[PDB]
Design a protein around this ligand. Structure first.
Ligand SMILES: O=C(N[C@@H](Cc1ccc(O)cc1)C(=O)O)c1cc(-c2ccccc2)c(=O)n2c1sc1ccc(OC3CCCCC3)cc12
Ligand SMILES: [Zn+2]
Ligand SMILES: [Zn+2]
Length: 576
């Protein structure tokens, strides 16, 4: 309470109207403080019309239901988030500590930690929105930020709360996120987890490059390629991991260390969380041993903790760590350090890690059964008995990573592409969703265009998607700019948010600026841009071959014209 008490007192005093201690609260692993009272999805008509066959598809239908109400916020909360991860064994705790140290040193070999700024935060906020904008322009916002910073320098914290008249707390939230960005932003802003700096990371590489990266790993001699899912990663982050993560502060300057120390000790290793629940109230809870997913640095810190954990699993697999070692309070460091120094970077290059998502090609398949450390650390795998060996892949094109798998294509001119793919229903289902309500047909059309153009660059190889994309582009006016973002994914670089010729953009991404494309001959026509094989298009969810799809394909200009006539008397272009 000596840390969180000051934040507890302010929310108490602010909402003392309806403040109380409800003894029928469902919080067993979280510490509960109090509560107070406070106040399906919409469909993209343009995309829907132009994808009629997928009206009668379960996965598309399922994606047309969002559970953003407080009913759903508690539904999945207690299952994973209200649980305790047992403390790792002394040996495991030492190994992690050594590895973390070694890893932090390796990452900061060239780069240097530094504070991010008001100007950077401002620049990002503006470009993103293209309400927080209003707060950034407000000078009194930044004055409040300074106030809290002085508290943070003093080791205290007053207003930094986390969420799972209104502008007051809205400023407090945004201000709290800036202070994080200030202290820990550099990890993201200076690209510490770029593949060049991290070896295993893929920050700033982009979806289009991920397939090429995995193919490169497959060339590395060793065992199979393992991509194990962790059950609720952010919930499995221990107190120990947080102690390992903060070791980064050792490379910071005094004034920067100072601020980062506060962020770690006061908002990560302790956290006062707001969570909404029907009875409609807001419960105030706190704990020390999990990740605040909405916070800044999360991706960076997950990537780090995962990199470490996999190196440790690799060590176990290689027979460096035994059961006895993990149990040992007085485990010797020599063999670990030796391993890290001689083989560490090599073993990092065998991995592609983005947050809790990982792919690993160990030197052999002992890794598959090396599960002592992995389970002991807390990173228990999803939907598989704790001690059952992992299922690896012998073809990199089967390996799942960042919600995708990847295909190697052969173009008509002999050159080879490597493209991202996933079930066609997931892509179409997502496209048919529009965000929120009160959207005009123009705004609805431009989102459809955004999605249509994303498919042109990333999923062009899917026959149905290319057809649907050309249909949407035909039905939507030419000079209308794609507005709202198609995804929040960190791997999306948003090359489709443009009114430039998509074949020109395609050429830029896949030929021109593609390090793996040696011959830079321009592809002059979409006829030269390849698809997957028919059978693999079908295996990944295509409806090519079905009558209904042939009907849809045959009757598509009629539907385009209907959308055109409802949009109005504008300038359209045909892409059929
Ligand atoms: O406030 C948020 N939601 C808004 C805004 C937003 C902004 C940025 C972002 O991406 C995602 C969402 C929305 O959904 O539109 C939000 C949500 C989430 C979130 C996502 C999945 C699960 C739980 C939380 C979220 O992750 N975030 C927000 S605002 C926000 C700001 C920065 C941020 O940094 C990332 C990248 C750099 C390293 C640290 C992590 C993350 C972040
Ligand atoms: Zn604070
Ligand atoms: Zn596929």
């Amino acid at each position: 309470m000596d840390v969180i008490g000051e934040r507890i007192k302010r929310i108490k005093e602010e909402h003392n109207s309806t403040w109380h201690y409800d003894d029928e609260n469902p919080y067993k692993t979280w510490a509960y403080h109090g509560s107070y009272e406070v106040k399906s999805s919409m469909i993209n008509g343009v995309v829907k019309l132009l994808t009629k066959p997928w009206d009668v598809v379960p996965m598309v239908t399922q994606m047309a239901m969002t559970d953003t109400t407080p009913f759903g916020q508690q539904r999945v909360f207690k299952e994973k988030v209200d649980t305790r991860t047992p403390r790792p064994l002394p040996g495991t705790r030492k190994v992690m500590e050594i590895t973390a140290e070694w890893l932090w040193r390796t990452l900061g070999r060239n780069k240097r930690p530094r504070l991010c700024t008001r100007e950077e935060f401002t620049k990002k906020v503006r470009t993103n929105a293209a309400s927080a904008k209003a707060a950034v322009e407000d000078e009194e916002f930044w004055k409040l930020v300074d106030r809290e910073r002085e508290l943070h320098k003093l080791g205290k914290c007053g207003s930094c709360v986390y969420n799972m008249g209104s502008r007051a707390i809205w400023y407090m939230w945004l201000g709290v996120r800036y202070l994080e960005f200030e202290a820990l932003g550099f990890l993201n802003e200076d690209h510490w987890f770029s593949r060049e700096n991290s070896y295993s990371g893929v920050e700033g590489e982009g979806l289009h490059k991920l397939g090429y990266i995995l193919r490169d790993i497959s060339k590395i001699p060793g065992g199979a390629m393992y991509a194990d899912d962790t059950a609720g990663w952010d919930t499995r982050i221990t107190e120990d991991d947080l102690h390992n993560e903060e070791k980064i502060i050792q490379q910071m300057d005094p004034e920067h260390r100072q601020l980062a120390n506060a962020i770690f000790k006061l908002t990560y290793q302790n956290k006062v969380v707001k969570v909404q629940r029907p009875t409609t109230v807001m419960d105030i809870i706190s704990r020390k041993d999990q990740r605040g997913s909405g916070q800044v640095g999360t991706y960076g810190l997950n990537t780090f903790t995962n990199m470490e954990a996999q190196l440790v699993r690799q060590m176990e697999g290689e027979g460096v760590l035994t059961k006895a070692d993990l149990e040992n309070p007085h485990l010797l460091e020599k063999k670990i350090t030796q391993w890290l120094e001689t083989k560490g970077v090599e073993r990092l290059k065998r991995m592609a890690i983005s947050g809790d998502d990982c792919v690993v090609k160990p030197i052999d398949d002992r890794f598959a059964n090396a599960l002592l450390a992995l389970n002991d650390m807390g990173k228990v795998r999803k939907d598989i008995p704790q001690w059952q060996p992992s299922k690896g892949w012998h073809d990199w094109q089967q390996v799942p990573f960042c919600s995708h798998h990847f295909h190697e294509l052969i173009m008509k001119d002999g050159r080879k592409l490597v493209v991202p793919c996933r079930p066609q229903d997931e892509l179409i289902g997502r496209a048919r969703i529009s965000q929120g309500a009160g959207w005009s047909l123009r705004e609805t059309a431009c989102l459809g265009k955004a999605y249509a153009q994303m498919w042109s660059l990333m999923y062009f190889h899917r026959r149905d998607l290319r057809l649907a994309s050309n249909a949407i582009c035909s039905a939507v006016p030419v000079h209308w700019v794609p507005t709202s973002r198609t995804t929040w994914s960190i791997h999306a670089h948003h090359q489709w948010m443009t009114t430039e010729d998509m074949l020109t953009v395609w050429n830029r991404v896949w030929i021109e600026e593609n390090p793996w494309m040696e011959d830079k001959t321009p592809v002059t026509t979409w006829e030269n841009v390849p698809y997957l094989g028919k059978r693999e298009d079908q295996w990944c969810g295509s409806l090519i071959g079905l009558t209904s799809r042939a009907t849809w394909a045959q009757n598509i200009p009629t539907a385009i014209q209907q959308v055109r006539s409802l949009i109005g008397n504008e300038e359209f272009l045909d892409y059929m």
